[PDB]
Amino acid sequence: ADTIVAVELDTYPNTDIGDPSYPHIGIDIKSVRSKKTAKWNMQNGKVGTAHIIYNSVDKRLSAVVSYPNADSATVSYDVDLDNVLPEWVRVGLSASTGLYKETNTILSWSFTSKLKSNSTHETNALHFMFNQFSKDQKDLILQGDATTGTDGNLELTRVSSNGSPQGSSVGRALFYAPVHIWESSAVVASFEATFTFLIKSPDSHPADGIAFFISNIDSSIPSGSTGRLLGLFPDAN
Amino acid sequence: ADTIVAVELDTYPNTDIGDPSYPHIGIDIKSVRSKKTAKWNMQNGKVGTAHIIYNSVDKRLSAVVSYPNADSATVSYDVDLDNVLPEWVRVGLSASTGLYKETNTILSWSFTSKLKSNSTHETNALHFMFNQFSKDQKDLILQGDATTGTDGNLELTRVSSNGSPQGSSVGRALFYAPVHIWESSAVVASFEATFTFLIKSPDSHPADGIAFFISNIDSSIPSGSTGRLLGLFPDAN
Ligand SMILES: [N-]=[N+]=NCc1cc(C(=O)NCCCO[C@H]2O[C@H](CO)[C@@H](O)[C@H](O)[C@@H]2O)cc(C(=O)NCCCO[C@H]2O[C@H](CO)[C@@H](O)[C@H](O)[C@@H]2O)c1
Ligand SMILES: [Ca+2]
Ligand SMILES: [Ca+2]
Ligand SMILES: [Mn+2]
Ligand SMILES: [Mn+2]
Incomplete structure (x- = not known):
């Protein structure tokens, strides 16, 4: 059982397991049943942007998702990641x-993480930014159907030669190096993540969504976690 | 209207037309509604083997399907193929x-058929064995989406470049030469069929199945027989 904290861009309402009856962004703490959600006007075929922020002083996890010239969707939740995630x-x-x-x-995808301790200017930090993915992206652990190189983009799920999406597909991409997300002696710990995405569906019923997540180091795709489970959870508990 | 006798490896339960509520192997005599069925623990992603046997003395059509290190499923039915199929x-x-x-x-696929008559040691026989299929398999009649050559295998239904299966696909492969399955003057008539298959599905709901069949010589894929009809029957009667 991995520990998962995630911000989900959920495109398909699975009402039998808690989803609101419309596309939404949500904050998931160890469960596919978002602790908090917000309505999201997902725009089929357009490039969107997601910003996830968190700092240990406020202990507030917030996410913003927007499209150019459009309103943005916000969701925020109070959580102390120290009591949830491993160091x-x-x-x-x-x-x-x-x-x-x-x-x-x-x-594209960028991440920044900082740990400031009880010392004079002693800050630890990790920062990576990908604006172009390559055929052999060695600093990324690809799991499931995820692939890179296609037009310099990262395709998290299966797409056919003619560019059409496929069902029952699940894929993940994790940064190669472990991240020191929190530490008992830290005065302030914080991270920020940003990624731009393009969700396109041939019909008027897109599924299932994208998610930014933080997990235990050895995490892998749970069995049968395609569809509603976003490749993150073993079940809908 | 073709005459069809078949042993089906049914992976998807279509309860509204008779299927038991689980994967099963069954014997179909002129109808998709199996005269007899048996529970089958289909193992996704593994190579299985099917053996079909029949002799005119017992007038018993039996089938065995198994996987390595696993139990096998058996189904057997009393039928006199003389009253059902043309010669x-x-x-x-x-x-x-x-x-x-x-x-x-x-x-792989192999078949043996024998006719022994009231003539001291006068036996007629046909036997073919395919352990490798080739790009141009001239002794096979391919119908529908069926193709050969891909890794030396026979793909009965459509598969995309990246190896993922597709829906609404139907395909058949018939041995080029007509088979003399029975004859009024025969003392004993018998046939045996064996084939190994690989059924793989990306999710947990595989469909629809494979079938070994015997039909009239000029048989072709019934219109609209994808899905539940296994490319064998025009309807669910
Ligand atoms: N498209 N569409 N259509 C209608 C339809 C809708 C739903 C549906 O909207 N379900 C919602 C939850 C989806 O739930 C799924 O999708 C959602 C969204 O991605 C995910 O979030 C979930 O996790 C899950 O993956 C289910 C079924 C269905 O089960 N049909 C059974 C008979 C199919 O009968 C046909 O197929 C059989 C087997 O191949 C054949 O034997 C037969 O002849 C015929 O061809 C059918
Ligand atoms: Ca959903
Ligand atoms: Ca069926
Ligand atoms: Mn959701
Ligand atoms: Mn059946």
Whole structure:
């Protein structure tokens, strides 16, 4: 059982497991049943941007998702990640499809993490920024159907030669190095993540969504976690 | 209207037309509604083996399907093929997908048929064995989406470049030469069929199955027989 904290861009309402009856962004703490959600006007075919922020002083996890010339969706939740996640973790992106599908394209991804301790200017930091993915992206752990190189983008789920999405696909991309997300002696700990995506669906029923997540270092795709589970959870508990 | 006798490896339960509520192997005499069925623990992603046997003395059609280190499923039915099939027929393999899908890969296929008459030691026989299929398999009649050559296997249904199965696909492969399956003057008539298959599905809902069948010589894929009809029957009567 991995420990998962995630911000989900959920495109398909699975009402039987808690989803609001419309596309939404949500904050998931160890469960696919978002602790908090917000309505999201997902725009089929357009490039969007997501910003996730957190700092140990406020203990507030917030996410903003927007499209150019459009309103943005915000969701924020009070949580002390010290009581939830192990000290070291891996961060990544996840996406899936089920009966319904969509392309889950990542055009760019950046992450920053900082630990400031009880010392004179003694800050530890990690920062990576990808604006172009390559055929052999060695600093990324690709899991499931995830692939890179196609137009310099990261395709989290299966796409056919003619560019059409496929169902029952699940894929993840985790940054290669473990991240020191919190530490008992830290005065302030914080991280920020940003990624631009392109979700396109041939019909009017896209599924299932993309997610930014933080997990235990050795995390892997749970069995049968395609569709509603976003490639993150073993079940809907 | 073709005459069809078949042993089906049904992976998807279509309860509204008779299927038990689980994967099963069954004997179909002129109807998709199996005269007899048996529970089958289909193992996703593994190579299985099917053996079909029949002799005119017992007038018993039996089938055994198994996987290495696993139990096998058996189904047997009393039928006098003389009253059902014409004297000459074609034998083959059929498979399909509907809304749900699976790869329907044949790795090998062999068939033996014998007619022993009231003539001291005068036996007629036909035997063919395929352990490798080639790009141009001239002794096979391919119908629907069926293709050969891909890794030396026979793909009964459509598979995309990246190896993922597709829906609404139907394909058949019939041995080129007509088979003399029975004859009024025969003391004993018998046939045996064996094939190994690989059914793989990306999710947990595989469909629709593979079938070994015997039909009239000029048989072709019934219109709209994808999905539940296994590319064998025009309807669910
Ligand atoms: N598209 N569409 N359509 C209608 C439809 C809708 C739903 C549906 O909207 N479900 C919602 C939850 C999806 O839930 C799934 O998708 C969502 C969204 O991605 C995910 O979030 C979930 O986690 C899950 O993956 C289910 C079924 C269905 O089960 N049909 C069964 C008979 C199919 O009968 C057909 O297929 C059979 C087998 O191949 C054949 O035997 C038969 O002849 C015929 O061809 C059918
Ligand atoms: Ca959902
Ligand atoms: Ca069925
Ligand atoms: Mn949701
Ligand atoms: Mn059946």
